[PDB]
Structure formats: C-alpha cells, structure tokens
C-alpha cells in the first residue's frame, strides 16, 4: 500500500488546477486505505454560504471527490463517472470548525462502484452530512 | 411580479461574494416567476472536472442555488435550509457548451419546500442532470 | 414492440403473481407508449399505513414497477435491475382517493436507464410523491 | 419507553394489519434500543420480483418500516411522516437467503429525524442495499 505522502501529493496535484477541483485546495488527507479515505478541512469564508456555514455545494463537492478517491484506491483503480449522488444535511458547520470527511466504499462491482461519505465535526464527532455516491466504471 | 433586471441584480449580488457562491458568477438569469427560475451558463474550464466536462460538484451547486432561488420566489419568500438533495447524472456537458438550469417548485408546505432542477444543453435540449432538493423552512 | 393492451395483460399477470408484485393487483394501466406509462389506483385499506394514508412502501413499489414498465417499453426491451431509487413525499394520499402514477423515461443509455415517476391526486392534480429510478441494463 | 419484547409485539400487530404492513409478517425482530433496531427475514417467494430475487419494493418497505421503528424508539416517541427516502441496491438477495435489516438513527432533531438502513446477507455480511430515510416529526 501507498505512503500517506504519496496520497497527499496525488491529492495536491488534483487540487492545484484551473478546474473546479481548485475549491478543495484547503483539504488535507489524513489517511488512505483501499476503499477508505479520511480527509480534514477547516471551514473558511470561501467554503461558506450566505449564513456563514459550510455551503451545501461545497459539501457536495467533498462527497463527490473524497468518495472518488476511495473508489480509486482499489485493484481496478478506476475513478468512474458519477451516476447518482445524494446528500442529507443534518448539522451546520460554522467558520473555524474543523471537519472530517470520511469516505468508505460499499461495493466495487464489475461496472458500478458505490461509496458512502460522512462529514463530521472533528472535535466532538457531530454528524454534519452523509452522502452516497454511485459511479459507473463500465 | 419583479422585472428580470431586479432578479438579475439580486442574483449578481449573491454571486459577488468571497463565499462559495462566487463559483456561480458566470451564471445568467433568463427568467423568473413564482416557483420557477431559468438560468443559463457557458461551461468554462473553471466549471470542469479533470476530464474537461461539467464538474459534478458544480452541477450540485447549481441545483442547490437555482432551486433556492425558485423556492424564495414565493408568498413566504423564505430560502430555507437544505435537508436532502439528490442528483442523477445522465449526459456530460463539455467546455464551450451552453446549459440551461431550470428549477421548478413542486410544493411549498408549512415547514418544507421541495423543488426539481433540470440541467439541459441549450442548443439541442439534451438532459445533462436532474436534481431534487428538499429544504426546511420551519 | 409492446402495446397498451399488452402492458394491461402484464398488470394482470405480473399482479396475480405469488411474488411481491401481487401488491399492485388493483392498479389499472391507462396509457402506454415507448418510454412512458400512466396508471391509476384507488387507495384502499390494503395500501395504507397505520395512519390511514398511502404507505411509503406501496409508493416505492409503484415507482419501482411502473418506471420498470416504461423502461421495458423500448426497442431494447430490457427491464434492467435497480441501482438507485429516491422518493420525495409531499402530500398524503388518503383511503378512497384516486391517484395517477406517471412514469417517464429520461434516458436510455448503453448500460443505464433513468426514469422519473410522479404520483398525483387524480381529482386535483396535486403531487403526492416524486421518484427517480436508475436501472442497470448491461 | 419501548423494549425489545414490545417492539416484537408491534411486529406481530403491525404485521397482521389489513394494511400494507402485512407484507412484513415474516420479519423477526432480533434487537432494539433507542435509535437502533435489527431485524431478520428469510427471503421467500412472496418477497420476490419476477427474477426470483428480493423485490426492490419489499426492500423499500423494510427500509421505511424498520427505520420508523428506530426513530419511534426515542424519548419523544414520534414515528414521524416520511419526507425523503433513497435506496442504493448493490447485491441481489435470492430466495432462501437470510437477510439482516439494520436501522440506525443518525439524528433526532426538533422537527426532523434521519436514519440509515443496511440490508445484509446474514451468512456472509455482504451489503444487499443501503437506504436513508428522513422523516418529519412536527
């Protein structure tokens, strides 16, 4: 399995982009194992909605990308293309709060991959949001 | 009902922000009626994933925000807070392609609002993605 | 290809199954064409939860099966296997109420099919529920 | 408060209803505590689609009802009304197979409750389906 430094470099390369992935530049990788990736982020103004809490679209981007990372850490190593994503929002995350983003692969099929993602407050473990992501690998 | 110019100014004010809503700065409002908002956007590099197609997180942000706009255009005028969002991805949108984002309110309840959003290719009407968004108004 | 009368025959044979599809025996097919099927049902005690309203599980079964019928009414004729289903519940349907279930295919791809389903109160057109169903054809 | 034996009694009374809940008559309750209920069922012909596997509608009913039981097992004791349900289907469950249905409440709010549900093959622990259910308590 890969060293944390390797995964961090891969992630940093992904985020150092003119594309939309740039919005994840503040995200840090804490751990990576086959089918499981844990990231951390401090919620800053750039990540927030009008009310100054973590934007639903930022949460969605996190779910999308961190689950993709976990799906990729597999025998096949294919990222796949998004088919379905759902997110349920349960607690607000305010500016300054540290969040954990935990993505777990539920199944790697012949053509489909499925993953779940929890966003939690790092300090007290409070559940911010949970998402599920289905991707087509072919 | 409000003039298009008024809605455009409100939207522009929303997007001219240090917050995450900044990612929608290229979006133009085409029409607004109670419970229904149509926006347009040209897909540029900043909106894309690694493959150079519209990023799933950008689509999610569009669904979130355009549905919020339609929910707000109501007797109550409350934006609400996200509870559940789902997106199904059906066709890729490439760089240079013009997209329509159409949000329709399905129901305004006493405490909950529900809206659907279609993303389509403006030129041929091809369905890019469809999302549904449930918000808590209280 | 299928015809309305052939789809009607299925809802007699699919519904007098010993299998779970038996729960749809009271459903009448009103209309069918490639990619779209419309059914009607009167809500009866057998369809209800303990609160006297249409059971969420019955709604899910309706979404599942009627979308499957619309997907199968195609040149390929594949019914597919379920991948993702989501349902948003907006208005209760009470005993005695006549409901319309309307399934429209959004895309038939090489390996995936996508359909939306509306359940409406027949008498006033109000939305009871809306579902989306993604199926794997490969 | 509820107890396991009381939840068991409900699955005898809820299940010998003339209503839709009758479809869960073969379900056995193994475990219950505030916010979590675990059930077991052997897949039988009555639970299947025309392909001899666990019907998606039966799965949805299981997700709906067992999550409702977990939500009701709380200090408030509100069963709630369904708002959103989503299910991802990952592995077929065949006739004769014993399945576990595990519902865990994620959050009980002032007006909303959120629960996740796993269906697993009892013999190997493989994930059949995973659902999320949001209910309104107000």
TrEMBL record, chains A, B, C, D:
Keyword annotations from UniProtKB, A to Z: Acetylation, Cytoplasm, Cytoskeleton, Hydrolase, Lipid metabolism, Mitochondrion, Nucleus
Reactions catalysed according to its record: hexadecanoyl-CoA + H2O = hexadecanoate + CoA + H(+); a fatty acyl-CoA + H2O = a fatty acid + CoA + H(+); hexanoyl-CoA + H2O = hexanoate + CoA + H(+); tetradecanoyl-CoA + H2O = tetradecanoate + CoA + H(+)
Compartments where located: Cytoplasm, Cytoskeleton, Spindle; Cytoplasm, Cytosol; Mitochondrion; Nucleus
Chief location category: cytoplasm
GO molecular function, one term: long-chain fatty acyl-CoA hydrolase activity
Cellular component, GO, one term: mitochondrion
Function: Catalyzes the hydrolysis of acyl-CoAs into free fatty acids and coenzyme A (CoASH), regulating their respective intracellular levels. Has acyl-CoA thioesterase activity towards medium (C12) and long-chain (C18) fatty acyl-CoA substrates. Can also hydrolyze 3-hydroxyphenylacetyl-CoA and 3,4-dihydroxyphenylacetyl-CoA (in vitro). May play a role in controlling adaptive thermogenesis.
Protein name, UniProt field: Acyl-coenzyme A thioesterase 13
Source lineage: Eukaryota, Metazoa, Chordata, Craniata, Vertebrata
